């Protein structure tokens, strides 16, 4: 066991998925700030197979999974892995494809019905419409598996209408719309309190 790094320490039943926009709408330095936000959030969670489980995926035209929910590693090592996520700078970061991945790979089987399941979709870009044909189907699929989708729009190129589409599919799908990556550290305490509140204590 590893002791808490902060007074805020979420010890609840939660599967938390971090989906990181891999597009070039974020510079390499801005992506660094996004990764620091993910690490900051992880430091405030009790990461363990019996408490908070985390997954970290960078999405472009396709997914690169760095951490899976079932990965039995020390929190310190998971935070190190997240801090070493490589910059992609891709042209396309498809929200449809990464939500498909979340629905059909991460939550293909619900191992923990007693836990809340939350997807933090950190978006900085807009995928081409030719990739969005099944976007609503995937968001609806996640709703049916009781997966809460929380879009975090970052910067002026975030897909605002997909964010609004996500909010409409289920009332749990609250959105956070930010000016830039610099705002992540300022809203972090609010976001993690909100996510913790969504999870049960027992």
């Amino acid at each position, epitope marked *: 066991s590893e*002791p*808490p*790094l*902060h*007074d*805020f*320490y*979420c*010890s*609840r039943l939660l599967d938390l998925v971090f989906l990181l926009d891999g597009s070039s709408r974020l510079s390499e330095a801005e992506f660094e700030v996004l990764k620091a936000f993910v690490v900051d959030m992880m430091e405030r969670l*009790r990461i363990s197979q*019996k408490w908070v489980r985390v997954a970290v995926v960078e999405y472009h035209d396709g997914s690169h999974a760095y951490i899976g929910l079932k990965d039995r590693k020390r929190p310190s090592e998971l935070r190190r892995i997240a801090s070493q996520v490589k910059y992609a700078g891709s042209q396309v970061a498809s929200t449809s494809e990464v939500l498909k991945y979340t629905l059909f790979q991460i939550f293909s089987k619900i191992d923990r019905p007693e836990a809340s399941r939350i997807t933090l979709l950190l978006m900085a870009s807009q995928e081409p419409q030719r990739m969005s044909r099944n976007f609503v189907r995937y968001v609806q699929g996640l709703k049916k598996k009781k997966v809460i989708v929380i879009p975090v729009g970052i910067g002026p190129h975030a897909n605002l209408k997909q964010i609004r589409l996500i909010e409409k599919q289920a009332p749990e799908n609250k959105a956070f719309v930010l000016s830039s990556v610099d705002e992540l550290e300022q809203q972090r305490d609010e976001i993690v*309190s909100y996510l*913790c509140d969504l999870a049960p*204590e*027992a």
Partner: nanobody, 128 residues
């Protein structure tokens, strides 16, 4: 559950020292904000020391401030109360307690109603 077990009480002369220990266990223990209460014979329970989840903040009432020190060891899941310059009026049963109301907030807790989990108490007697 959360389980708490205290030790370290004793019989001391005025001016003496003790160091109470409280061992926490149970799967739902989350390095909760912890506190020490004391109960003089036939009276109520009073919070005499409190500490945050990390240990970076503490609280004592002015009646024991300067003389009591609360600390914790999260690797060992322990909390401690060092009691210096003991006075006759410190005679009481001392209880270790853990806050279980919105425990994700690890700040120091001063309200007794925030304390959910309790040890069995250890006796401190100060007599000349």
């Amino acid at each position: 559950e959360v389980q708490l077990v205290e030790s370290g009480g004793g019989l001391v002369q005025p001016g003496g020292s003790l160091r109470l220990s409280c061992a926490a266990s149970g799967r739902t223990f989350s390095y909760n904000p912890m506190g020490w209460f004391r109960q003089a014979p036939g009276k109520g329970r009073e919070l005499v020391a409190a500490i945050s989840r990390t240990g970076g903040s503490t609280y004592y009432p002015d009646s024991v401030e300067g003389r009591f020190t609360i600390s914790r060891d999260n690797a060992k899941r322990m909390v401690y109360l060092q009691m210096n310059s003991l006075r006759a009026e410190d005679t009481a049963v001392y209880y270790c307690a853990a806050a279980g109301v919105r425990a994700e907030d690890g700040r120091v807790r001063t309200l007794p109603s925030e304390y959910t989990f309790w040890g069995q108490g250890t006796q401190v007697t100060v007599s000349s």
